[PDB]
Design an enzyme around this catalytic site. Sequence first.
Site, PDB file in Angstrom:
ATOM      1  N   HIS A 102      14.051  14.174  11.929  1.00 59.30           N
ATOM      2  CA  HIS A 102      12.848  14.197  12.747  1.00 59.30           C
ATOM      3  C   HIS A 102      12.077  12.890  12.645  1.00 59.30           C
ATOM      4  N   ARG A 153       1.079   1.738  15.122  1.00 62.15           N
ATOM      5  CA  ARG A 153       0.927   1.527  13.690  1.00 62.15           C
ATOM      6  C   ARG A 153       1.351   0.110  13.307  1.00 62.15           C
ATOM      7  N   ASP A 196       7.530  21.133 -27.860  1.00 64.09           N
ATOM      8  CA  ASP A 196       7.454  19.827 -27.200  1.00 64.09           C
ATOM      9  C   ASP A 196       8.546  19.761 -26.123  1.00 64.09           C
ATOM     10  N   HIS A 225       0.831  -1.194   0.000  1.00 60.05           N
ATOM     11  CA  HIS A 225       0.000   0.000   0.000  1.00 60.05           C
ATOM     12  C   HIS A 225       0.870   1.251   0.000  1.00 60.05           C
ATOM     13  N   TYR A 257       8.259  16.251   0.107  1.00 65.35           N
ATOM     14  CA  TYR A 257       8.132  17.542  -0.560  1.00 65.35           C
ATOM     15  C   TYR A 257       8.233  17.442  -2.069  1.00 65.35           C
TER      16      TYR A 257
HETATM   17  C1  HEA Z   1       3.460  15.316   1.464  1.00 62.20           C
HETATM   18  C2  HEA Z   1       3.405  14.703   2.630  1.00 62.20           C
HETATM   19  C3  HEA Z   1       3.926  15.398   3.828  1.00 62.20           C
HETATM   20  C4  HEA Z   1       4.076  16.794   4.166  1.00 62.20           C
HETATM   21  C5  HEA Z   1       3.821  18.125   3.513  1.00 62.20           C
HETATM   22  C6  HEA Z   1       4.653  16.763   5.527  1.00 62.20           C
HETATM   23  C7  HEA Z   1       4.955  17.915   6.205  1.00 62.20           C
HETATM   24  C8  HEA Z   1       5.491  17.960   7.464  1.00 62.20           C
HETATM   25  N1  HEA Z   1       5.794  16.857   8.220  1.00 62.20           N
HETATM   26 FE1  HEA Z   1       5.561  14.958   7.725  1.00 62.20          FE
HETATM   27  N2  HEA Z   1       5.324  13.060   7.235  1.00 62.20           N
HETATM   28  C9  HEA Z   1       4.827  12.553   6.078  1.00 62.20           C
HETATM   29  C10 HEA Z   1       4.388  13.283   5.017  1.00 62.20           C
HETATM   30  C11 HEA Z   1       4.390  14.647   5.001  1.00 62.20           C
HETATM   31  N3  HEA Z   1       4.828  15.486   5.983  1.00 62.20           N
HETATM   32  C12 HEA Z   1       4.805  11.075   6.086  1.00 62.20           C
HETATM   33  C13 HEA Z   1       4.294  10.342   4.878  1.00 62.20           C
HETATM   34  C14 HEA Z   1       5.356  10.672   7.354  1.00 62.20           C
HETATM   35  C15 HEA Z   1       5.546   9.298   7.938  1.00 62.20           C
HETATM   36  C16 HEA Z   1       6.564   8.475   7.168  1.00 62.20           C
HETATM   37  C17 HEA Z   1       6.762   7.252   8.024  1.00 62.20           C
HETATM   38  O1  HEA Z   1       7.094   7.472   9.213  1.00 62.20           O
HETATM   39  O2  HEA Z   1       6.671   6.112   7.543  1.00 62.20           O
HETATM   40  C18 HEA Z   1       5.629  11.978   7.995  1.00 62.20           C
HETATM   41  C19 HEA Z   1       6.155  12.003   9.243  1.00 62.20           C
HETATM   42  C20 HEA Z   1       6.462  13.138   9.918  1.00 62.20           C
HETATM   43  C21 HEA Z   1       7.013  13.020  11.276  1.00 62.20           C
HETATM   44  C22 HEA Z   1       7.365  11.773  12.035  1.00 62.20           C
HETATM   45  C23 HEA Z   1       6.552  11.611  13.304  1.00 62.20           C
HETATM   46  C24 HEA Z   1       6.954  10.265  13.843  1.00 62.20           C
HETATM   47  O3  HEA Z   1       7.689   9.552  13.129  1.00 62.20           O
HETATM   48  O4  HEA Z   1       6.566   9.924  14.979  1.00 62.20           O
HETATM   49  C25 HEA Z   1       7.186  14.418  11.617  1.00 62.20           C
HETATM   50  C26 HEA Z   1       7.760  14.996  12.849  1.00 62.20           C
HETATM   51  O5  HEA Z   1       8.693  15.769  12.750  1.00 62.20           O
HETATM   52  C27 HEA Z   1       6.737  15.214  10.463  1.00 62.20           C
HETATM   53  C28 HEA Z   1       6.735  16.577  10.451  1.00 62.20           C
HETATM   54  C29 HEA Z   1       6.299  17.324   9.395  1.00 62.20           C
HETATM   55  C30 HEA Z   1       6.340  18.797   9.443  1.00 62.20           C
HETATM   56  C31 HEA Z   1       6.874  19.461  10.683  1.00 62.20           C
HETATM   57  C32 HEA Z   1       5.800  19.235   8.175  1.00 62.20           C
HETATM   58  C33 HEA Z   1       5.582  20.582   7.584  1.00 62.20           C
HETATM   59  O6  HEA Z   1       5.805  20.575   6.171  1.00 62.20           O
HETATM   60  C34 HEA Z   1       4.180  21.135   7.823  1.00 62.20           C
HETATM   61  C35 HEA Z   1       4.189  22.610   7.430  1.00 62.20           C
HETATM   62  C36 HEA Z   1       2.792  23.174   7.332  1.00 62.20           C
HETATM   63  C37 HEA Z   1       2.238  23.881   8.329  1.00 62.20           C
HETATM   64  C38 HEA Z   1       3.012  24.154   9.578  1.00 62.20           C
HETATM   65  C39 HEA Z   1       0.840  24.426   8.170  1.00 62.20           C
HETATM   66  C40 HEA Z   1       0.810  25.579   7.172  1.00 62.20           C
HETATM   67  C41 HEA Z   1       1.580  26.735   7.763  1.00 62.20           C
HETATM   68  C42 HEA Z   1       0.947  27.648   8.522  1.00 62.20           C
HETATM   69  C43 HEA Z   1      -0.533  27.557   8.736  1.00 62.20           C
HETATM   70  C44 HEA Z   1       1.719  28.806   9.104  1.00 62.20           C
HETATM   71  C45 HEA Z   1       1.400  28.973  10.586  1.00 62.20           C
HETATM   72  C46 HEA Z   1       1.849  27.717  11.298  1.00 62.20           C
HETATM   73  C47 HEA Z   1       2.827  27.772  12.215  1.00 62.20           C
HETATM   74  C48 HEA Z   1       3.488  29.082  12.531  1.00 62.20           C
HETATM   75  C49 HEA Z   1       3.278  26.528  12.920  1.00 62.20           C
HETATM   76  N4  HEA Z   1       6.288  14.411   9.468  1.00 62.20           N
HETATM   77  C1  HEA Z   2      -0.224   8.949  -1.151  1.00 61.30           C
HETATM   78  C2  HEA Z   2      -0.204   7.731  -0.656  1.00 61.30           C
HETATM   79  C3  HEA Z   2      -1.402   7.180   0.015  1.00 61.30           C
HETATM   80  C4  HEA Z   2      -2.819   7.252  -0.265  1.00 61.30           C
HETATM   81  C5  HEA Z   2      -3.721   7.870  -1.298  1.00 61.30           C
HETATM   82  C6  HEA Z   2      -3.420   6.472   0.838  1.00 61.30           C
HETATM   83  C7  HEA Z   2      -4.768   6.297   0.940  1.00 61.30           C
HETATM   84  C8  HEA Z   2      -5.365   5.589   1.941  1.00 61.30           C
HETATM   85  N1  HEA Z   2      -4.733   4.957   2.969  1.00 61.30           N
HETATM   86 FE1  HEA Z   2      -2.798   4.897   3.304  1.00 61.30          FE
HETATM   87  N2  HEA Z   2      -0.863   4.815   3.641  1.00 61.30           N
HETATM   88  C9  HEA Z   2       0.124   5.378   2.907  1.00 61.30           C
HETATM   89  C10 HEA Z   2      -0.048   6.115   1.777  1.00 61.30           C
HETATM   90  C11 HEA Z   2      -1.270   6.381   1.235  1.00 61.30           C
HETATM   91  N3  HEA Z   2      -2.481   5.977   1.698  1.00 61.30           N
HETATM   92  C12 HEA Z   2       1.454   5.103   3.477  1.00 61.30           C
HETATM   93  C13 HEA Z   2       2.662   5.660   2.783  1.00 61.30           C
HETATM   94  C14 HEA Z   2       1.231   4.305   4.661  1.00 61.30           C
HETATM   95  C15 HEA Z   2       2.213   3.727   5.641  1.00 61.30           C
HETATM   96  C16 HEA Z   2       2.709   2.398   5.090  1.00 61.30           C
HETATM   97  C17 HEA Z   2       3.319   1.608   6.217  1.00 61.30           C
HETATM   98  O1  HEA Z   2       2.793   1.682   7.347  1.00 61.30           O
HETATM   99  O2  HEA Z   2       4.323   0.906   5.980  1.00 61.30           O
HETATM  100  C18 HEA Z   2      -0.236   4.183   4.666  1.00 61.30           C
HETATM  101  C19 HEA Z   2      -0.832   3.481   5.658  1.00 61.30           C
HETATM  102  C20 HEA Z   2      -2.172   3.312   5.753  1.00 61.30           C
HETATM  103  C21 HEA Z   2      -2.710   2.503   6.855  1.00 61.30           C
HETATM  104  C22 HEA Z   2      -1.983   1.873   8.002  1.00 61.30           C
HETATM  105  C23 HEA Z   2      -1.914   0.364   7.961  1.00 61.30           C
HETATM  106  C24 HEA Z   2      -0.851   0.057   8.977  1.00 61.30           C
HETATM  107  O3  HEA Z   2       0.354   0.190   8.681  1.00 61.30           O
HETATM  108  O4  HEA Z   2      -1.245  -0.375  10.077  1.00 61.30           O
HETATM  109  C25 HEA Z   2      -4.126   2.615   6.601  1.00 61.30           C
HETATM  110  C26 HEA Z   2      -5.288   2.049   7.306  1.00 61.30           C
HETATM  111  O5  HEA Z   2      -5.559   2.537   8.390  1.00 61.30           O
HETATM  112  C27 HEA Z   2      -4.303   3.391   5.375  1.00 61.30           C
HETATM  113  C28 HEA Z   2      -5.529   3.648   4.852  1.00 61.30           C
HETATM  114  C29 HEA Z   2      -5.709   4.379   3.723  1.00 61.30           C
HETATM  115  C30 HEA Z   2      -7.056   4.625   3.190  1.00 61.30           C
HETATM  116  C31 HEA Z   2      -8.234   4.049   3.922  1.00 61.30           C
HETATM  117  C32 HEA Z   2      -6.829   5.434   2.016  1.00 61.30           C
HETATM  118  C33 HEA Z   2      -7.677   6.027   0.968  1.00 61.30           C
HETATM  119  O6  HEA Z   2      -8.353   4.949   0.321  1.00 61.30           O
HETATM  120  C34 HEA Z   2      -8.717   6.969   1.538  1.00 61.30           C
HETATM  121  C35 HEA Z   2      -9.798   7.215   0.492  1.00 61.30           C
HETATM  122  C36 HEA Z   2      -9.302   8.001  -0.701  1.00 61.30           C
HETATM  123  C37 HEA Z   2      -9.398   7.501  -1.944  1.00 61.30           C
HETATM  124  C38 HEA Z   2      -9.946   6.121  -2.136  1.00 61.30           C
HETATM  125  C39 HEA Z   2      -8.910   8.291  -3.141  1.00 61.30           C
HETATM  126  C40 HEA Z   2      -7.541   7.789  -3.577  1.00 61.30           C
HETATM  127  C41 HEA Z   2      -7.431   7.887  -5.086  1.00 61.30           C
HETATM  128  C42 HEA Z   2      -6.237   7.845  -5.685  1.00 61.30           C
HETATM  129  C43 HEA Z   2      -4.999   7.656  -4.856  1.00 61.30           C
HETATM  130  C44 HEA Z   2      -6.062   7.932  -7.183  1.00 61.30           C
HETATM  131  C45 HEA Z   2      -5.703   9.348  -7.616  1.00 61.30           C
HETATM  132  C46 HEA Z   2      -5.387   9.325  -9.093  1.00 61.30           C
HETATM  133  C47 HEA Z   2      -5.706  10.366  -9.866  1.00 61.30           C
HETATM  134  C48 HEA Z   2      -6.396  11.551  -9.262  1.00 61.30           C
HETATM  135  C49 HEA Z   2      -5.384  10.347 -11.330  1.00 61.30           C
HETATM  136  N4  HEA Z   2      -3.109   3.805   4.900  1.00 61.30           N
HETATM  137  O1  LIG Z   3       7.630  14.906   6.979  1.00 58.91           O
HETATM  138  O2  LIG Z   3       8.065  13.587   6.564  1.00 58.91           O
HETATM  139 CU   LIG Z   4       9.996  13.980   7.335  1.00 59.08          CU
END
Ligand code: HEA
Ligand code: HEA
Ligand SMILES: [O-][O-]
Ligand SMILES: [Cu+2]
Lengths: 124, 60, 196, 459, 61, 76, 186, 103, 65
Positions: free
Chosen positions: D277, D428, D90, D60, D232
């Site tokens: 982090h 998790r 292109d 997944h 990002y």
């Molecule tokens: C595109 C996906 C995406 C994006 C954008 C981010 C964005 C951020 N993520 Fe991420 N993160 C993930 C995807 C993402 N993350 C995934 C997939 C994991 C788990 C992977 C795994 O462990 O397997 C993860 C895990 C993850 C952890 C791990 C927690 C843990 O392992 O226990 C942490 C902690 O530092 C973190 C922090 C952040 C922070 C600080 C931002 C920042 O970018 C957020 C910035 C945005 C805002 C802050 C809000 C908008 C800003 C404002 C409204 C301004 C005013 C706000 C303030 C002044 C605070 N992320």
């Molecule tokens: C971007 C990536 C992505 C997306 C879309 C999703 C979508 C969803 N995920 Fe996700 N999920 C992950 C990335 C994502 N996940 C990752 C990275 C983990 C951690 C893996 C790990 O633990 O090792 C995770 C783990 C994770 C778990 C944890 C299982 C576990 O480790 O214990 C669960 C269930 O609770 C879950 C549920 C869902 C559900 C219910 C949806 C969605 O079905 C919710 C409903 C939304 C939709 C059905 C729309 C989605 C449609 C598209 C994606 C197609 C888009 C295409 C076009 C627009 C052209 N996800």
């Molecule tokens: O934030 O990964």
């Molecule tokens: Cu990170």
Amino acid sequence: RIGGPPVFMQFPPPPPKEYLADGTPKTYPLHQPVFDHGYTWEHWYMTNAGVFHTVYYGEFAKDFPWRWGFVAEKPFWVGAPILVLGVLCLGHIIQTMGQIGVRPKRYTPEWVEATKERERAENT
Amino acid sequence: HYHPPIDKKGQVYVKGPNTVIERGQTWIKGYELPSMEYTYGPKQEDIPFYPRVKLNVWGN
Amino acid sequence: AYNGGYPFHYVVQYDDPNYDCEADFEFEEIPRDEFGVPAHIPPELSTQIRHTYYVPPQYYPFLKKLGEDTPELKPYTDKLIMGDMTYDDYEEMFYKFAKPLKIYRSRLPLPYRTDEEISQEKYVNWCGRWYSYRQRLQGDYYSRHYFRDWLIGVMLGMYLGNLCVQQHRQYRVDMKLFYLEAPEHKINWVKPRGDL
Amino acid sequence: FYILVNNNKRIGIYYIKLSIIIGILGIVLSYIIRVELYNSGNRIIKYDNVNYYNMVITLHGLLMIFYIIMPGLYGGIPLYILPILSVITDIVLPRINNISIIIVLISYIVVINSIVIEYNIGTGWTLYPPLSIIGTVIVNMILYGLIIIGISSIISAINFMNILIVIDGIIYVYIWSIIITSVLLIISLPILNGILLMILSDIYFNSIYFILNGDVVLYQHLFWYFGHPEVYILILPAFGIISIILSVLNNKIIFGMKSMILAIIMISILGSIVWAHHIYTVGLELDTKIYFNNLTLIISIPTGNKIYNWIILYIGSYNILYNGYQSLIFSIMFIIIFIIGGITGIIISIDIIDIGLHDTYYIVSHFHYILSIGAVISLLAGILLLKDIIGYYNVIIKINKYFGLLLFININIIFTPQFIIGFNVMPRRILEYSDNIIVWNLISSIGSISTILILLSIF
Amino acid sequence: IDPTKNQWRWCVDPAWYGGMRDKANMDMYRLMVYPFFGYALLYLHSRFKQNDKYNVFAKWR
Amino acid sequence: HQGTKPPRPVSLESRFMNQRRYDFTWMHPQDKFCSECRPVELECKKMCFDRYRSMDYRMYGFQRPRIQTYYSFSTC
Amino acid sequence: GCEAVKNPLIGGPNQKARGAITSGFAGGGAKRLGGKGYGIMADWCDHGYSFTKGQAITGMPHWPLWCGGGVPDKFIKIDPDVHFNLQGYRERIGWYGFFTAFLQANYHAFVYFVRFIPINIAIFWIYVNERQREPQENVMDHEEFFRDFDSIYLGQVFDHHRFAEWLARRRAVKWGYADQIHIPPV
Amino acid sequence: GRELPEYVVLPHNQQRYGRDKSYSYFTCLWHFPKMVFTEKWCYTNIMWFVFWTGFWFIPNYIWWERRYAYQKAGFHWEHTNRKLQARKEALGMDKVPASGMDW
Amino acid sequence: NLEDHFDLAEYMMKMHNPMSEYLYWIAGFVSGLHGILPLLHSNYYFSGMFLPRDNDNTQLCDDSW
Ligand code: HEA
Ligand code: HEA
Ligand SMILES: [O-][O-]
Ligand SMILES: [Cu+2]
Ligand SMILES: CCCCCCCCCCCCCCCCCC(=O)OC[C@H](COP(=O)([O-])OCC(O)COP(=O)([O-])OC[C@@H](COC(=O)CCCCCCCCCCCCCCCCC)OC(=O)CCCCCCCCCCCCCCCCC)OC(=O)CCCCCCCCCCCCCCCCC
Ligand SMILES: [K+]
């Protein structure tokens, strides 16, 4: 550059039109169906047509299947709330079909009391 | 089916503009697209009014 | 000042009329340059030597006619007649008399507009200025209204945040009384279960 | 032809088509997970087949990240409009563009074939050793897929960078969004390849990097040095789309274009230096933890500037224009949803808060709100904006308020409860759990089945 | 030398500037499609058998 | 120098030395020659080849004395 | 099928009637063998410089780029009208012609392999020549080494010929051929 | 240069193609199988693909099955060793010359 | 030519054969099966059943069914 890919070329005329033996114009496949149902609503929406223009875009009921013509005819705040509840109810029903009659022993009153005893002893 | 389009003089057929001389001046009449009823179907009447307005910009 | 001074294209001459630099593999023939300088005389030395173009004297009357018809061209033609025209002098003459192509707007056909339409040009410009005046003023008006509104959001977010501050404040007071007064806190109570 | 085509716009369509196909497999896996988690007990996976659940969650994650959202937001929309936005005929590298999509498909076939033929075991999408290196051949197959995917990603990044040499107009914000993602890929991918090769060496070449006297924490550094830049690389193209949609639909010029651009550049640099982090609970040195926590919180500044610049784009727009178009609703929903995901990210950024919330479903909900909701909706909104240009039909999406409302409500029913169970706490990557966490898990499960049903109404 | 007699540069893709030679190379590789499918399908069978996945029913019978 | 490299002490098998999770077969996935020997462990392979030869299976190498071959760089 | 395949020729008359162009050689116009001509003049045979004869067959290539230009019509041999128009070319060339065309389409790859293989053969010779030799004695007993550290560790630098002879005798003892070899005296 | 007419009258008078008929949600459930089993171009392409994929699967299958059985019987040297013990038993000799060599 | 002006002209002009759409949906359906079929196969391989009965890995009441 002489003899290079031309910047512009005029389209050649289209191929000759085909008539049937009786003179009827020959028709070709067309995926623009006229769905059959009793709905005739017409919804119009002002749309962005660039920066300084708009276009009045219309959606006609006959362009859509019966299911959408039926749903799109009703007021949104009449249908939406009912649909939200319906989808949620169906989800629960689906997830309950596989557990009809399942009675784990840990949810019986005897087990429920025993956990209370454990919590009292452990001050949970 | 190799068939080079360009001719000996490095030319290809180009359709000219609709030229109309008048008032001691050569004019070109632009091609106006057909009525949207022909292409889309709805009759172009009772169109809602969307006035010209310059871009909505933030000031100060 | 391009390609290290090496000309992209240059003339080479060979003394033997039947010489081929690709078929022959002899090691005595020395190539010459466009002016005829043998290759064994380095460029730094040959470029200092002054080379001038010599036309047959039968051309002098023609070169004289050119100078008279175009007096600005006379000094260059005189150099050529007197055998004082180098390659640089020729280049100066060449680029001095090059002129750019001219485009005439009076020959462009215009998009069709009726005489009625042509008399309304001032009106349309007038409308455009008023539209720009109204646009610019509205920008100030809107900027003031919406940025001021954002303050309502700050105040609404400060009120809602303060609600959780008060809950947190009461939480800390309660926590301080747990280990001190709460009967829920029990000591000498939990006994080890032991291995099963 | 079909497979031989080099047209950049055709290839863009292929990327979207393949993302939807592979996406079906992704969503199915998600349904399996949520069904299993509906109560305590075994529901659809036997206790003797628990290895399958570990494989389901692993695939997944990997598929949705590398085979669906990345090919859709960095391969699909980019390959279709970028050469048009750049007023160029292109794409610079036609033949490379063709092979990239073919590579993605071939790596997908390898992965799914490995499900069918190999024993099904899982080690997470983060492939932590030593667990990843003591597994069966399915792990080897997954590694081949990732490396092959890496080739496609890097060559596509090279392709986009060459637009700077040929762009005949102005570099719009969206073009800047793709260029910076391309830079992030060029700098992060080579490090990933190295660490993946070391995983292979230990799996297949009797190497000893991930056995005693070799530091397993080493992998986490190199992996996450690519990991966070990846999140990002997946969000920045979405930001670029949001900017175009808001400006076009509201008929308003982008406000603070240079600040938008400089915010994207800033996020990239900062995102390249905050990876640890993800490693807060390993036991790093106090000063390291403080550095990473400090720099992680800084990323909010540039990210916040972009959010507020988007808000003013929607403010003040003409009322006469109909605002119920699906593309506009999705773009607005992105701002509302992304703030939730980002704020929770800042909460988890505090390491002491993170001790409690690491490896809990709070992290899940955090990155789902950004990706499963925000990124998906951004891709949908972008495709919807280009419906006329792309030319697809036979769907009822363009004006469908029911779909947007139902999606928003039900998607929140799935992941909002996952924030609650994070303080319950439910770890998790588990399938069985204590009976006192059923309520919230059940509610989220009801949300998952409902969202799937709403996906059928579009046709 | 005549500039208008080189239009094959843009009329024909570079991959087929070689005429029949370039068409033959493509055609030859085309002939190998189904042999590849059988070969690839065999590998799937090999792994499927070696993992004892064919005895799923015989195991419990 | 390499042709007459001095012998070095046999390594004592320390806490983290000579750890193996599986046999060495990445060079010969199907044949699996010298599964116990390391990829460039020449002395282990020589004795392993001798076993195969004693089992009627021919293997190449490790049979000519160094001083009786050309290009050995080990002659006095 | 067609006359061209039956009677292969380079730059003859009636090319269109013959039905195909079987030669990839392009250019000509040299006044002598190996001389300056037009076109690139590349082929599988009879081109370039002959090593055995020590003579040039065709001149250096005349590229259709800035450094050169077009080929005069007098010396063009690949007519695009006949070279292209592949409609039903397989019937004109037959099955053996198809095999020939495929083989001839890979001249570029063949040219590379002719330049790449030799160095790799040389590298392989290093391996084969070493594999034949018995392994050197990489290691000895840990204890005995340290009881005679100076002799063993430094013997090579002080006298390499005697150290080489000593090593040889130890190899003869370790592999049981000491009585079958006569180790030359140092 | 080619001359074509403005229109052509076809010999037949069959209106084979036109606008789609109104379809329901599950129309595909019967129309798609109908095309597969009733449209020639569909079932000739399916049979062609199946036949040739299986055709080239057989020779690979036969080769691998023999190889797999051999590999399970032992390593290459274990096979040659079994033939060496048999030859030693046939002759009653404890040590025999290696294959390809005389006594 | 006018027919070649638009990419995927048959589909854009609404003349394409419906089989192309059917194949796309079938391909997606097959992709989905890669998550369900191995689930059933693996369950049977290690248990003897294609799917479990809810809470059959825990103690159940006498009347549970
Ligand atoms: C595109 C996906 C995406 C994006 C954008 C981010 C964005 C951020 N993520 Fe991420 N993160 C993930 C995807 C993402 N993350 C995934 C997939 C994991 C788990 C992977 C795994 O462990 O397997 C993860 C895990 C993850 C952890 C791990 C927690 C843990 O392992 O226990 C942490 C902690 O530092 C973190 C922090 C952040 C922070 C600080 C931002 C920042 O970018 C957020 C910035 C945005 C805002 C802050 C809000 C908008 C800003 C404002 C409204 C301004 C005013 C706000 C303030 C002044 C605070 N992320
Ligand atoms: C971007 C990536 C992505 C997306 C879309 C999703 C979508 C969803 N995920 Fe996700 N999920 C992950 C990335 C994502 N996940 C990752 C990275 C983990 C951690 C893996 C790990 O633990 O090792 C995770 C783990 C994770 C778990 C944890 C299982 C576990 O480790 O214990 C669960 C269930 O609770 C879950 C549920 C869902 C559900 C219910 C949806 C969605 O079905 C919710 C409903 C939304 C939709 C059905 C729309 C989605 C449609 C598209 C994606 C197609 C888009 C295409 C076009 C627009 C052209 N996800
Ligand atoms: O934030 O990964
Ligand atoms: Cu990170
Ligand atoms: C996330 C989901 C929800 C999303 C919602 C939101 C969506 C928003 C909108 C998104 C829009 C994106 C942009 C769209 C742009 C569209 C452009 C376009 O249309 O391009 C034209 C393009 C081609 O049109 P064309 O130009 O006319 O092409 C002519 C052909 O090139 C030439 O024509 P031809 O007839 O000569 O064609 C050759 C044809 C020849 O075809 C035939 O002869 C077919 C004969 C009938 C066969 C039928 C299948 C039979 C299956 C039998 C199974 C038996 C199982 C037995 C089990 C027994 C168990 C006991 O095909 C072939 O020869 C090769 C076919 C290869 C592809 C199919 C592969 C199928 C799966 C294979 C799996 C294999 C697994 C092996 C495992 C082995 C393990 C060891 O269109 C398509 O390809 C169709 C696209 C349709 C959808 C477009 C998007 C619509 C809007 C979205 C709707 C929702 C979709 C949701 C996803 C799907 C859910 C399932
Ligand atoms: K469960």
